[PDB]
């Protein structure tokens, strides 16, 4: 009755396809890069 | 100087004939334009 563990270990590559099955149905999301770091400080010109 | 008038030695160009034989007063020079252009960066774009 040891065949259960051996077959679980051996025929365990097709589960990779399962990932695609969840990846195909699901909806992904990409985002643009945010400008990092501090920002330069610049005001107006002197007013009269 | 305006002929047949009550005032002479007038200053400034008259409004009658401001050209007097010229069409374009060509003015050549160098201009520097330091402006606040609306543009974020080469950022704000998908990384891939």
CB-based contact B46:A32 (threshold 8 Å): yes
Structure determined by = cryo-EM
Distance CA B43, CA A33 (A): 6
Task: Report whether A32 contacts B45 (CB < 8 A).
Answer: yes
* Smallest CA–CA distance from B40 into chain A, residue: A35
Q: Mind telling me how many Å the CA of A31 is from chain B's nearest CA?
A: 6
The resolution of the experimental structure, rounded to one decimal in Å, is: 4.7
Name the 3-class secondary structure at A32. Answer: strand
Residue B36's closest CA among A46, A38, A29, A45? A45
The number of helices, as runs of H, and strands, as runs of E, in chain B is 0, 0
């Amino acid at each position: 009755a040891s065949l259960i563990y051996r077959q679980l270990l051996t025929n365990s590559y097709t589960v990779d396809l399962s990932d695609e099955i969840q990846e195909i149905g699901s909806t992904k999301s990409q985002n643009v890069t945010i400008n990092p770091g501090p920002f330069a400080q610049t005001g107006y010109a002197p007013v009269n | 100087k305006l002929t047949r008038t009550r005032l002479d030695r007038l200053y400034g160009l008259p409004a009658a004939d401001p050209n007097n034989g010229k069409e374009y007063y060509e003015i050549a020079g160098r201009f520097s334009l330091i402006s606040l252009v609306p543009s974020n960066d080469d950022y704000q774009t998908p990384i891939a």
